[PDB]
Amino acid sequence: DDEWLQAEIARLKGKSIVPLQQVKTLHDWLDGKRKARKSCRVVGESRTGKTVACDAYRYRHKPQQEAGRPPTVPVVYIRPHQKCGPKDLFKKITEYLKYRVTKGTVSDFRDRTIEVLKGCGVEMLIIDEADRLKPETFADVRDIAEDLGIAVVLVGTDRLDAVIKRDEQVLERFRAHLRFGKLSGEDFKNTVEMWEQMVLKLPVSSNLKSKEMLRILTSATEGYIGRLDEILREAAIRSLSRGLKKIDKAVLQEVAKEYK
Amino acid sequence: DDEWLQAEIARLKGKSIVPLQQVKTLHDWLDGKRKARKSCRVVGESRTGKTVACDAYRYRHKPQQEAGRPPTVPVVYIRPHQKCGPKDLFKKITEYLKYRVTKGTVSDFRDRTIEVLKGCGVEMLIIDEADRLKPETFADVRDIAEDLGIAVVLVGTDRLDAVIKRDEQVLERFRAHLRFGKLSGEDFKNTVEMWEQMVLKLPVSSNLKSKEMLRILTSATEGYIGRLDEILREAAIRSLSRGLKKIDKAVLQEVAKEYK
Amino acid sequence: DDEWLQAEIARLKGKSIVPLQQVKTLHDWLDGKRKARKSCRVVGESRTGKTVACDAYRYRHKPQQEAGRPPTVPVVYIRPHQKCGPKDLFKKITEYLKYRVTKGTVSDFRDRTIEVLKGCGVEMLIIDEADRLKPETFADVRDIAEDLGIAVVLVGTDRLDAVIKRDEQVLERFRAHLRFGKLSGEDFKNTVEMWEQMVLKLPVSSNLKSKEMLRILTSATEGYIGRLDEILREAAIRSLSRGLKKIDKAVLQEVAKEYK
Amino acid sequence: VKPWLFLIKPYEGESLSHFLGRFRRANHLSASGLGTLAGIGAIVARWERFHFNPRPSQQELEAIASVVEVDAQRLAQMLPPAGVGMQHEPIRLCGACYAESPCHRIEWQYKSVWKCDRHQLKILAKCPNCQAPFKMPALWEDGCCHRCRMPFAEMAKLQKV
Ligand SMILES: Nc1ncnc2c1ncn2[C@@H]1O[C@H](COP(=O)(O)OP(=O)(O)OP(=O)(O)O)[C@@H](O)[C@H]1O
Numbered sequence: 019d020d021e022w023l024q025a026e027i028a029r030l031k032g033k034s035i036v037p038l039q040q041v042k043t044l045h046d047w048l049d050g051k052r053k054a055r056k057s058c059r060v061v062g063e064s065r066t067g068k069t070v071a072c073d074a075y076r077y078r079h080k081p082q083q084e085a086g087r088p089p090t091v092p093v094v095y096i097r098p099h100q101k102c103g104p105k106d107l108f109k110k111i112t113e114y115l116k117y118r119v120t121k122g123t124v125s126d127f128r129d130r131t132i133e134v135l136k137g138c139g140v141e142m143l144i145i146d147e148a149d150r151l152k153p154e155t156f157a158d159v160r161d162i163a164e165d166l167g168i169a170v171v172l173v174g175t176d177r178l179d180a181v182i183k184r185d186e187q188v189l190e191r192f193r194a195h196l197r198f199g200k201l202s203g204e205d206f207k208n209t210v211e212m213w214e215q216m217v218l219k220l221p222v223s224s225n226l227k228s229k230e231m232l233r234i235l236t237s238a239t240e241g242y243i244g245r246l247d248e249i250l251r252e253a254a255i256r257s258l259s260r261g262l263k264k265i266d267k268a269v270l271q272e273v274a275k276e277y278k
Numbered sequence: 279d280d281e282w283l284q285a286e287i288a289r290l291k292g293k294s295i296v297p298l299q300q301v302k303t304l305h306d307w308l309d310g311k312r313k314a315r316k317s318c319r320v321v322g323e324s325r326t327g328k329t330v331a332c333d334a335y336r337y338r339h340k341p342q343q344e345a346g347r348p349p350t351v352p353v354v355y356i357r358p359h360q361k362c363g364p365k366d367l368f369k370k371i372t373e374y375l376k377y378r379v380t381k382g383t384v385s386d387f388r389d390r391t392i393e394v395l396k397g398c399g400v401e402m403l404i405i406d407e408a409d410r411l412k413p414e415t416f417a418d419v420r421d422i423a424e425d426l427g428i429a430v431v432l433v434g435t436d437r438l439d440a441v442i443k444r445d446e447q448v449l450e451r452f453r454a455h456l457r458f459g460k461l462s463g464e465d466f467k468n469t470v471e472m473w474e475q476m477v478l479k480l481p482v483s484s485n486l487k488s489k490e491m492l493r494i495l496t497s498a499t500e501g502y503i504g505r506l507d508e509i510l511r512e513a514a515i516r517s518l519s520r521g522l523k524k525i526d527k528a529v530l531q532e533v534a535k536e537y538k
Numbered sequence: 539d540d541e542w543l544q545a546e547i548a549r550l551k552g553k554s555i556v557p558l559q560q561v562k563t564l565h566d567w568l569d570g571k572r573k574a575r576k577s578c579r580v581v582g583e584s585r586t587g588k589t590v591a592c593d594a595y596r597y598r599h600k601p602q603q604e605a606g607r608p609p610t611v612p613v614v615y616i617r618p619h620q621k622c623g624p625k626d627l628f629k630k631i632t633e634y635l636k637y638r639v640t641k642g643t644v645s646d647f648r649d650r651t652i653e654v655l656k657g658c659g660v661e662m663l664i665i666d667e668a669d670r671l672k673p674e675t676f677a678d679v680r681d682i683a684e685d686l687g688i689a690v691v692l693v694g695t696d697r698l699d700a701v702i703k704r705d706e707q708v709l710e711r712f713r714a715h716l717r718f719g720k721l722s723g724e725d726f727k728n729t730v731e732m733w734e735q736m737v738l739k740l741p742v743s744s745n746l747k748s749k750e751m752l753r754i755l756t757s758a759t760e761g762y763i764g765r766l767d768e769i770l771r772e773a774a775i776r777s778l779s780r781g782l783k784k785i786d787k788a789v790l791q792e793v794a795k796e797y798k
Numbered sequence: 799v800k801p802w803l804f805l806i807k808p809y810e811g812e813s814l815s816h817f818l819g820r821f822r823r824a825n826h827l828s829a830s831g832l833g834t835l836a837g838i839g840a841i842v843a844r845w846e847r848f849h850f851n852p853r854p855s856q857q858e859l860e861a862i863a864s865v866v867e868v869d870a871q872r873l874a875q876m877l878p879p880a881g882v883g884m885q886h887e888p889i890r891l892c893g894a895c896y897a898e899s900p901c902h903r904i905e906w907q908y909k910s911v912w913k914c915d916r917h918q919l920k921i922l923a924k925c926p927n928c929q930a931p932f933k934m935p936a937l938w939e940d941g942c943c944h945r946c947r948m949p950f951a952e953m954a955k956l957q958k959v
């Protein structure tokens with residue numbers, strides 16, 4: 019049982035990807051923009067679940083490699099770090115395609131990145147946290163989207179929109195967006211029920227997501243998927259730590275008052 | 279029994295040639311380049327297994343003893359020294375052949391290597407670690423390829439790609455290129471389940487690339503066939519030395535800890 | 539007892555090798571990599587070890603020399619000088635095995651050192667202070683390890699890690715490692731006692747891991763064993779210089795003030 | 799441990815040239831290098847082509863004995879005995895005696911020798927298939943004619959009885 023308890027707590031620590039209508043809409047729109055090389059910019063709140071949806075769109079087109087040619091990765095996902103320069107960005111592009119860099123000037127990195135980009139036949143350039151990179155690199159990404167014809171999706175918080183708004187070309191060229199919703203409603207109840215079924219993976223004690231539980235979770239998460247994940251995982255781990263097989267009212271109240 | 283154990287660990291510690299799909303497609307590519315007599319350049323990231331594939335190729339087309347004339351050698355495999363001049367390249371290419379030249383000068387040596395190359399009618403010249411050569415030697419390599427119509431296969435890592443991109447006339451003839459495979463995807467399952475008994479040759483614990491074993495391997499090798507090779511062999515040595523029947527989870531986690 | 543005084547000072551000036559947990563761990567790890575013939579990289583911190591233990595390991599497997607035949611030395615320990623070239627590495631290898639040729643072309647010298655490594659039955663090549671050689675020599679070291687199946691042990695500080703991480707192939711050759719720690723905690727409580735009874739071997743002061751001296755010892759040595767050696771040996775020298783039978787805390791404070 | 803070298807035991811009737819060539823190839827040395835190590839200079843490079851204009855002296859052979867670790871008398875036993883005349887050119891070889899033992903016999907270079915006493919074959923002065931004169935014995939990396947790559951042991955059945 020102790021080994022089973024350790025397995026349960028380790029699984030609860032690990033986050034999962036339940037496919038729901040938000041990620042469904044996102045990757046449907048992503049496929050639509052991919053089929054026409056339309057460079058858009060998906061936007062949304064913080065801790066809402068855009069990156070996970072992007073991740074899923076990245077893994078679904080798992081690259082299929084030929085016997086003796088470079089693999090065809092159709093979707094490229096990068097998450098440049100804070101104040102990411104152009105050399106760093108090109109390094110990331112060529113590193114994702116599994117092409118280790120060689121020391122040189124920025125021009126050398128740009129040329130190698132262009133070469134590996136055309137050779138691999140990439141279709142998508144997903145730049146999450148696109149509010150981090152410097153504006154001297156937005157010209158580079160503009161040229162990438164222009165000459166190489168790769169649809170770029172600038173992903174980030176609403177601060178990304180402010181970052182690109184002060185610029186001239188990047189705002190006009192990247193205008194199509196997909197704002198992430200709050201999810202509050204009956205769809206939220208469906209979400210929490212589905213999370214109970216799959217993510218929690220607890221024995222069926224007929225919790226059924228009662229009205230009091232729904233009110234507590236609504237007051238806690240405020241519609242955030244990440245908040246819901248964190249609170250559910252914390253409640254499950256706290257119940258399993260005190261020997262409680264299922265999740266009762268006290269742990270929900272404790273985590274809710276701890277968070278707010 | 280310790281003699282049998284020592285023989286087994288001697289087999290493990292020895293580098294063994296093992297058949298993959300990538301080596302077979304490389305052999306097909308190189309046969310095509312032979313029949314075309316067209317220059318090529320196989321490139322791949324480190325420990326991906328280019329050297330062993332080229333060695334297996336040159337063993338496949340072993341030289342034949344000719345009766346009327348000195349024997350004809352199909353392929354020449356040379357691994358030059360780091361920052362070695364063209365004189366040493368000529369010395370190695372002659373010494374690989376049965377011929378041998380001493381004294382003389384660089385022009386004399388180049389004339390002699392031209393004569394021995396035309397005499398043997400060598401088809402391909404697989405230079406391993408091509409980037410070890412000085413840039414001036416690349417002009418000599420071009421001259422050999424152009425005057426003798428010999429398909430030169432430049433084997434090396436992406437540093438070779440950068441080196442050939444540095445100069446124009448050197449890269450002029452090497453239009454074609456074969457990119458080696460990282461082996462990511464489902465191919466890992468086949469390669470691990472084959473390597474379990476093809477190479478290790480011990481009573482298997484029916485691991486069959488089990489979820490725990492496969493995930494612990496992907497956490498250490500990342501598709502580097504050489505990585506999994508030496509990891510599995512060293513782990514088998516550790517398991518057999520301590521008196522264990524077959525490998526277990528503890529030794530794999532220890533070797534993964536010492537690797538990552 | 540003046541003559542007795544320089545007798546004690548002559549005894550103390552030498553560098554006795556205390557046995558310790560770290561030296562045994564390194565010996566066992568090196569033995570395992572040697573039987574596996576696997577190249578490893580002992581990354582460590584300055585003054586912590588990697589010399590006394592590594593040198594002791596060559597003393598463990600004492601070379602045997604026939605009267606008129608090449609010797610068989612299993613472990614070859616060298617310390618390359620600053621910015622040593624390939625000829626310097628080859629000459630260190632040649633001179634360690636007491637070969638009787640010392641001049642020649644660098645290519646011929648490489649061939650000679652390969653022949654002596656194959657002929658002397660060497661299996662482990664310890665390169666202490668591997669932070670003192672160019673990457674071209676690293677390439678030569680890679681060639682040595684590949685051709686002769688040698689377990690090459692790279693010894694140095696983390697600057698060694700920085701030096702080898704800039705080259706693709708050197709990183710993959712030596713992923714295996716072993717960090718030397720600082721033993722911050724329980725180990726000093728016995729290390730001080732061992733150092734006081736054996737290498738000191740002076741009239742016992744009933745020190746017995748007293749917290750009074752333990753505090754100043756921790757504040758001075760900070761956890762580096764070589765620092766402890768200097769401090770304790772100098773303290774004993776000063777104690778006998780003033781003729782004190784025991785090592786008083788006053789001289790400990792004096793040597794601490796000298797060191798910091 | 800004691801200073802050492804890749805020692806080679808001399809054959810029976812081998813040449814000084816061939817023995818020094820085997821010693822060099824097994825030590826990856828050079829004629830100038832071997833001479834400098836021995837302390838006699840480029841004289842070694844002369845001996846590899848049998849130019850004994852000043853016969854190899856006792857001192858010039860003791861100095862070699864110090865390096866190759868072969869007794870000086872055993873060294874003189876690969877030079878022609880005092881008074882016996884040898885021809886430094888052409889280099890001559892018997893195929894059968896090479897098949898028996900891969901070496902070059904100093905007795906083949908004698909002016910008075912045309913027949914292999916233990917094979918009853920007229921020894922060869924040039925390659926029997928392409929008429930290519932043989933190299934210096936020290937230059938025999940292996941037993942084959944340089945121009946035609948025919949093994950030395952094979953030539954036994956081309957050389958006349
Ligand atoms: N489809 C999904 N299935 C399961 N969990 C999800 C899903 N989408 C998001 N999450 C959860 O959301 C949290 C993190 O969301 P994510 O990192 O995708 O946010 P984001 O919208 O990109 O915003 P941020 O910029 O604040 O990181 C995690 O707790 C993760 O489990």
Ligand SMILES: Nc1ncnc2c1ncn2[C@@H]1O[C@H](COP(=O)(O)OP(=O)(O)OP(=O)(O)O)[C@@H](O)[C@H]1O
Pocket residue numbers: 293294295296297298301322323324325326327328329330331434435503504505507508707
């Ligand atoms: N086809 C193969 N079969 C068996 N082992 C292989 C194969 N390819 C590579 N290896 C293993 O990889 C290691 C050597 O790989 P190899 O030198 O061929 O790779 P490489 O990608 O050319 O890299 P490098 O240039 O750095 O040497 C050895 O451990 C060897 O066992």
Ligand SMILES: Nc1ncnc2c1ncn2[C@@H]1O[C@H](COP(=O)(O)OP(=O)(O)OP(=O)(O)O)[C@@H](O)[C@H]1O
Pocket residue numbers: 553554555556557558561583584585586587588589590591694695763764765767768
């Ligand atoms: N295991 C040991 N037993 C006894 N003394 C030791 C031991 N290890 C180190 N010392 C002492 O440390 C000093 C030398 O340190 P050492 O040469 O081991 O350092 P290192 O870590 O190899 O050095 P570097 O800073 O060059 O990496 C000497 O005073 C020696 O007595």
Ligand SMILES: [Mg+2]
Pocket residue numbers: 065068069
């Ligand atoms: Mg995010």
Ligand SMILES: [Mg+2]
Pocket residue numbers: 325327328329330
């Ligand atoms: Mg290789």
Ligand SMILES: [Mg+2]
Pocket residue numbers: 585587588589667
């Ligand atoms: Mg040191």
Ligand SMILES: [Zn+2]
Pocket residue numbers: 892893894895896914916917
């Ligand atoms: Zn004969």
Ligand SMILES: [Zn+2]
Pocket residue numbers: 925926927928929930943944945946947948
């Ligand atoms: Zn011939």
